[PDB]
Design a protein around this ligand. Structure first.
Ligand SMILES: OC[C@H]1O[C@H](O[C@H]2[C@H](O)[C@@H](O)[C@@H](O[C@H]3[C@H](O)[C@@H](O)[C@@H](O[C@H]4[C@H](O)[C@@H](O)[C@@H](O)O[C@@H]4CO)O[C@@H]3CO)O[C@@H]2CO)[C@H](O)[C@@H](O)[C@@H]1O
Ligand SMILES: [Ca+2]
Ligand SMILES: [Ca+2]
Length: 415
């Protein structure tokens, strides 16, 4: 495992990560108070499957509830107490220790934008009228105000002023706490549209400068005002700008948007396909997460933007053979039977030496997507939903078959 920032100072931890999202939306209901125990038991298997990192659920306890129904998943935490719906503080420490001991770095989902302000019994009690909250200032709509330099969560009544020195420090200290006491190797920043990207850079510089990080910016061009350059920009440009300012990798919602709306050929327009290595190397690619995807359990989870099953294998073959840093969703890997296929693709990635900044060229003249990827050890030819017959049609050199699945709809050859 190589460490190191990118040439532009972006915290992609060497560019060689392969990440497991270590939960789905309904874990707190499907395995009540037992998830950390399960992760501890599974740590050696996760490592053997080839993952270098695991994205853990929000560790801050969440006892919220609403009615569809939900609550408790971590995105409406009420304080930093770790005794929540995934397991106890002791069980978290044991799971993080087992994962780290198996060689899997532990990334915590953190949620600075808001908290369960109204929960009656909590350790963090911030009064009104001291600038701690967005709505201490006038709040006319979903955009920055004088107490919140980002967007708001729903009505904004629970948004924190993360730029207030006491609130900034509160999160700074808790990130340090996760690093010193809970084995954190990095962080996944939730809802980064809600606060300034430079604050993520500051938090990471203060508390985890050499760690991995990734931000979730999910905000399309149409959500920006008419006078903002982002209103007419590409999804790539929007997330890349965030990454530049946070000095942090960013989830590749440009690729996700193309997977949901475009053809397979169009997947080349994700951030991770950009010919500038400074652009593609900061992409964190994924197929679905706990928001976009289904989960086992009530209501099938959230499934706000889910990839149809006829493209799941193709999508994993693309992200696991291509540049950027790939994330595998728990339920594809361990609930729904794609594990053996994903295991094989992870081995292909590692054997070829594909990294976040590997070159990728796209080839015209065939159906579907045809790419050549320059790994540090091998060149890959990847053909998805394509009438390509053999790799010699598009690449020089000697190749052998590495993957052939879904009646040839997923084919990968290696030098
Ligand atoms: O005071 C603020 C608001 O409080 C109340 O809001 C409710 C919502 O109505 C519920 O839907 C729910 O919200 C969930 C949300 O549905 C869910 O998707 C998730 O959001 C995450 C996301 O998964 C994550 O990856 C990233 O994008 O950030 C998102 C936000 O953290 O989690 C939400 C919180 O559990 O719960 C809230 C709070 O109870 C009230 O109804 C609003 O009117 C009010 O403005
Ligand atoms: Ca690394
Ligand atoms: Ca906010």
């Amino acid at each position: 495992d190589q460490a190191g920032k990118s040439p532009a100072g972006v915290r992609y931890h060497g560019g060689d990560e392969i990440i497991l999202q270590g939960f789905h939306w309904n874990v707190v209901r499907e395995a009540p108070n037992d998830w950390y125990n399960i992760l501890r038991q599974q740590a050696s298997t996760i490592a053997a499957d080839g993952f270098s990192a695991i994205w853990m659920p929000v560790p801050w306890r969440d006892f919220s509830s609403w009615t569809k129904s939900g609550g408790g998943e971590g995105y409406f935490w009420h304080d930093f107490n770790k005794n929540g719906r995934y397991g106890s503080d002791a069980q978290l420490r044991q799971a993080a220790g087992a994962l780290g001991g198996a060689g899997v770095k532990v990334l915590y989902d953190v949620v600075p934008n808001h908290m369960n302000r109204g929960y009656p019994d909590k350790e963090i009690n911030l009064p009104a009228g001291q600038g701690f909250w967005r709505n201490d200032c006038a709040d006319p709509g979903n955009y920055p105000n004088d107490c919140d330099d980002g967007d708001r969560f729903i009505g904004g009544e629970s948004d924190l002023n993360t730029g207030h020195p006491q609130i900034y420090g509160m999160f700074r200290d808790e990130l340090a706490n996760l690093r010193s006491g809970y084995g954190a190797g990095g962080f996944r920043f939730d809802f980064v549209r809600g606060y300034a990207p430079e604050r993520v850079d500051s938090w990471m510089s203060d508390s985890a400068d050499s760690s991995f990080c990734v931000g979730e910016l999910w905000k399309g061009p149409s959500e920006y005002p008419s006078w903002d350059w982002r209103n007419t920009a590409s999804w790539q440009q929007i997330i890349k700008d965030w990454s530049d300012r946070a000095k942090c990798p960013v989830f590749d919602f440009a690729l996700k948007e193309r997977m949901q709306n475009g053809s397979v050929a169009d997947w080349k327009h994700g951030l991770n396909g950009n010919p500038d290595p400074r652009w593609r190397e900061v992409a964190v690619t994924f197929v679905d997460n706990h928001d976009t995807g289904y989960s086992p359990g009530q209501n099938g989870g959230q499934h706000h933007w889910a990839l149809q099953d006829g493209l799941i294998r193709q999508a994993y073959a693309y992200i696991l053979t291509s540049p950027g840093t790939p994330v595998v969703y728990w339920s594809h890997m361990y609930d729904w039977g794609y594990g053996d296929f994903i295991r094989q693709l992870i081995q292909v990635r590692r054997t070829a030496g594909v990294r976040a900044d590997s070159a990728i060229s796209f080839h015209s003249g065939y159906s579907g997507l045809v790419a050549t990827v320059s790994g540090s050890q091998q060149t890959l030819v990847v053909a998805l939903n394509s009438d390509l017959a053999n790799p010699g049609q598009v690449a020089s050199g000697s190749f052998s078959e590495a993957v052939n699945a879904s009646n040839g709809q997923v084919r990968v050859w290696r030098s």
